[PDB]
Design a protein around this nucleic acid. Sequence first.
RNA 1: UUCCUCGUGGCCCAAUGGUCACGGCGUCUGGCUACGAACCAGAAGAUUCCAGGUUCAAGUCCUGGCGGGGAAGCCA
RNA 2: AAGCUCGUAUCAGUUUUAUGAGGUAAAGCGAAUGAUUAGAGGUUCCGGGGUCGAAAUGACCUUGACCUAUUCUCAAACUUUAAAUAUGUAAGAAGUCCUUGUUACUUAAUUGAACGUGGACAUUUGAAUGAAGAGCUUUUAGUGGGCCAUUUUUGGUAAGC
RNA 3: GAGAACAGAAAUCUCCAGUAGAACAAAAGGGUAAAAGCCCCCUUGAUUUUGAUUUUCAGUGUGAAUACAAACCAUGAAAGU
RNA 4: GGUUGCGGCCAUAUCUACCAGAAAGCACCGUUUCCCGUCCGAUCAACUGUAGUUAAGCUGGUAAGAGCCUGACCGAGUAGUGUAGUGGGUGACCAUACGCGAAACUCAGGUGCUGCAAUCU
Lengths: 296, 169, 159, 220
Amino acid sequence: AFQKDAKSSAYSSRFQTPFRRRREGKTDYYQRKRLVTQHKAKYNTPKYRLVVRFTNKDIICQIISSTITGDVVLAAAYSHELPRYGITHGLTNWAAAYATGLLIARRTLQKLGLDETYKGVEEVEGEYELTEAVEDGPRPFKVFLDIGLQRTTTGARVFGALKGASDGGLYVPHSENRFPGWDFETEEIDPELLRSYIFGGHVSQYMEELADDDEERFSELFKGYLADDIDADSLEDIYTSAHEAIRADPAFKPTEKKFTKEQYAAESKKYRQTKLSKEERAARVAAKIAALAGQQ
Amino acid sequence: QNPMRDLKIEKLVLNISVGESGDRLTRASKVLEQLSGQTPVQSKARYTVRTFGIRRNEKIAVHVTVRGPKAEEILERGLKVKEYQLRDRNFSATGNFGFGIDEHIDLGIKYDPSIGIFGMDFYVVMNRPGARVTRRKRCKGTVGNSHKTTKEDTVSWFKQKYDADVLDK
Amino acid sequence: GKSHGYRSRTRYMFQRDFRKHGAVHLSTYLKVYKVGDIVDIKANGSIQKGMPHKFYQGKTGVVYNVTKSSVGVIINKMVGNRYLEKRLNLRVEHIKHSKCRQEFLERVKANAAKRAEAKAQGVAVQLKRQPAQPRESRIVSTEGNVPQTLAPVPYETFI
Amino acid sequence: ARRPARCYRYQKNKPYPKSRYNRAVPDSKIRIYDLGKKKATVDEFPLCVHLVSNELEQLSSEALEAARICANKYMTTVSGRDAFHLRVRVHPFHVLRINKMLSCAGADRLQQGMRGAWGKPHGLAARVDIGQIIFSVRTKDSNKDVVVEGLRRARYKFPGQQKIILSKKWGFTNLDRPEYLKKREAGEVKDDGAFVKFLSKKGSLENNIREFPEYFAAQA
RNA sequence: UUCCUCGUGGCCCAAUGGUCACGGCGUCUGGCUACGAACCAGAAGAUUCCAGGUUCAAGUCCUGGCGGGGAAGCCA
RNA sequence: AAGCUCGUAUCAGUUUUAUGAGGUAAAGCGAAUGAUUAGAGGUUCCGGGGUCGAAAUGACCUUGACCUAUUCUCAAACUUUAAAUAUGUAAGAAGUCCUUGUUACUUAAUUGAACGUGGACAUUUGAAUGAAGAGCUUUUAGUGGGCCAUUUUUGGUAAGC
RNA sequence: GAGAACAGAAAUCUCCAGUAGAACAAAAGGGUAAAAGCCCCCUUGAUUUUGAUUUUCAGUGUGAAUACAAACCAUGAAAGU
RNA sequence: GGUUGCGGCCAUAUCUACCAGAAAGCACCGUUUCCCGUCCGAUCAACUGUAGUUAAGCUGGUAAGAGCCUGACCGAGUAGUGUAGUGGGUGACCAUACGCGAAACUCAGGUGCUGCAAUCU
């Protein structure tokens, strides 16, 4: 709505477009190079990255390698799948990030064959520890966190997913200085606080605080809990049972697709617009010249 | 056709360009602090002029940003000063406006003679909902022309509330 | 008075291929270089580390070593009346495989296949490359395409 | 002062223009390149007579000025100031140097001969090819015999051989005479100041119409 | 022609890269004197030869041009 | 000069096929940087000068840049583009393919990397032409003032410079 | 470019456009945009050992640079640098 | 076929101005106890899919659109160039012979293709 701007022919002629994913605003190629580039003396060893992404209303954790044709997915795990493990509400939170990390870890490890060993932490107390290597056996699966364009802060759910994968069995190299409970003035982690952040201590504490501070809010928020007969102290047990079920069977049963591919495609083509042709363009131009200056 | 193409106050910037630093500028900081409730920020000079008597990085001015009910409150109590009368200028082509006042005790602030008297520049900047598309990190985009803030729309909004007018041409 | 430095006379050489500045794509880094592999050298001005000297621009060598970020290339450089074997250590941004050798190896596979087909179906392999031979006796036809006669044209200015 | 032009007739050196490296040059003698009825619509003057070089050489600014003056004065005397639009279709950009040896008695106050012989700017010259147009005119078709004589008189003030060709195409534009007439009748032409803008079949139709209402209008 | 140096209020002259610039004479005002000088008090006067760049800041630092002065121009 | 090891090995002041690199000539500048001629149309409250005006984000003329579309002519130290000539590599037996061993390197991994065993493919064995032999070593002389011609080119008015 | 009292051609604040027309100690050239630039945080890898390679080149030296190795460190969530 | 995450080639993908978008998914959107970061819960962080919307982003379509890409006996076998001559010309330079061969201009056409995983009336 402003024609002083007027990107000229020269500007357009010698403009260099960025890469498409940079135009979109979805990929930092600086990070991508320094994360994907492999030691050339390994020659085909794929450098596996754990891509963690947070949309609204969904977490996406997937294990990816790179190739000239395109990235290749080894395993994937989403938070809309957690209902089959017993998590209906609050599936974009720190705890669901932990659970999704555990899920993608155990899923990969199952389909790869290592799941008998490297069973990780089954006594979660929020203690910093990496998956050590079993002497007289294979080494653990190594995978590097790809955040993306998200900011590194302490108390975040990319690192929740990372903690979950590390406790699930993957060797995810990391320090402890971006988990919650990281005391800043003196550098020591607080495992009881971290365990609460796993099992919904901050969520349940907020629910308890609204149960005596203000109930209108507690009603408009947290409506699903009231509908599904959930009080604060059930949350730890819920997430514990969910972790146990994930360790029991993560093998990814998918959905049924309910009016499948060709039905979907027909329904979409009904509403999608086809373009035009040259004859139609010439006809449009002929009509426009007969209309505008013709004046009937 | 205004479900979500409604016009709200993005923010209000209170600026005080004291010519130089010192106790004067601390007193201006106290002014803005007691006014808004936030801690202000002291801005430095970019270059040197000397006709004004300033040099680089001298901490020349102060300002503060306010958003929301506090912003519209400060706006109305500081626009009662202007009598709900503004110009047809004072309105940018981008849908934002502003006005300068003198002697800020016009806004209900007692003198506090340790502080003194200071003028101010209010600048109000507007936005429709969906301004995050420009200010976010990921998938940073631009706003459609149908959704942009205009002088005309800002004026119509400024009239349809405050029952004010656009005097002086 | 004189100037004979490393990046001397390298304005346009390491100039950066209009509307292709910045942010080298990653197939560059995902390509794989084994020892005994033929590579053409083409520098990139955006990557100042691991560069070759301007002499090796456009030259083509064989990999002798592979490291973290670089590969080692054998070149042969003419010095007087002999060729000297030179060993460069170049980052892979300045490097790319040779489609010449790729084509030769495809031709090898094809020759092997043709030889096996002829062993199965009858000998007389005849699988060399011959040059472009002279062309055999054709017969044109007129058939509507009658010969259109031409003549020179005179001098006109049309200025 | 001002050694002759046989010393600088031929293109022996690369072009050496006024720039950030070669500064401190003198100014050209010729500053006026267009004269006559410069503010003339293209329909006034269909003819054109080009003065065209046959040799590859250099032309001094001095000679261009002299030729301009001679031609212009012949025009203004015979047919008048408003019967022609003379244009000088070549510009002096090439700087010519002198080493400037001493002539008083250069025995001891030597200048060291050919030592440091890189010259200082002497003057300017236009660098000219074969077939390169010089001195276009654009008159009416009834002043041909006048402009040809003007250019013939100018031809003595240039070295080389410089022929005179009678052109087509409304000669400060391209577009041969019948084609221009076809376009002018079909309304594909707008008269900009002293020159025409043409209708194309590429732009947006809105602005094409609002610049050319006539082209396919049924009224015309 | 090469090299060296200088260019500042009407005049002569100085300046730490760090206040749109010190002094002295001339000029102007007032006062002492019957009057003028001399003296006492006070004022005004500047685009630092011209054109560019460095620096936050150039009178000053870097390049070119203009004018003044000086040294050099030898062996034959 | 002495020769030595061998006797078509592999080579070549050459071409061809494939594949690279280059930023000169030309070209372009209604394409960036610069230089540059001329008009046309808009733009100001936000340049100056005039008429009407006590003033007026007051009415009208003058030039000034600024913008848009056009127009003429240029670039050794400008360029989107871009030759010809010249230049690199390859054209296979030290090769290709299949099986499988060694390792302290590498891998999540008996997965890879490098080197191998064993096996299969030979006389169009993997373009052309030639090859008065190919490869190798030792020692030593003289020389280390150059000049001319075509073409490319710098300085110079030019020169048997 | 459009706007805000003192505040003006240049003070501080806000918005829009802006492929780089800026900055990167210093010549010029090259290169660089969620950067190689500007701001902030932490640091000393401007460390150790001794070799190889490129340029100048006689294939010597010096200088300068390149890529690894064995260590020790920094930084970062990390890959990595 | 649509969408999302991660991408490959990096404008046939960009830019300007308008028009549509069922389902799902993205998205905008709501809140500030805790982790966290700010002059400011705008950004960043965390909590709710709850209060609401397709307005915007995003996706596609249109434009005798700007740009970009492709192609051509379009210009042009032109300019320019390798080789040759006791060739022309005072010369500048030019033609011819055996070869290679452009750029602009013109015209026509096109205006993202695609990989892995998942999901969708």
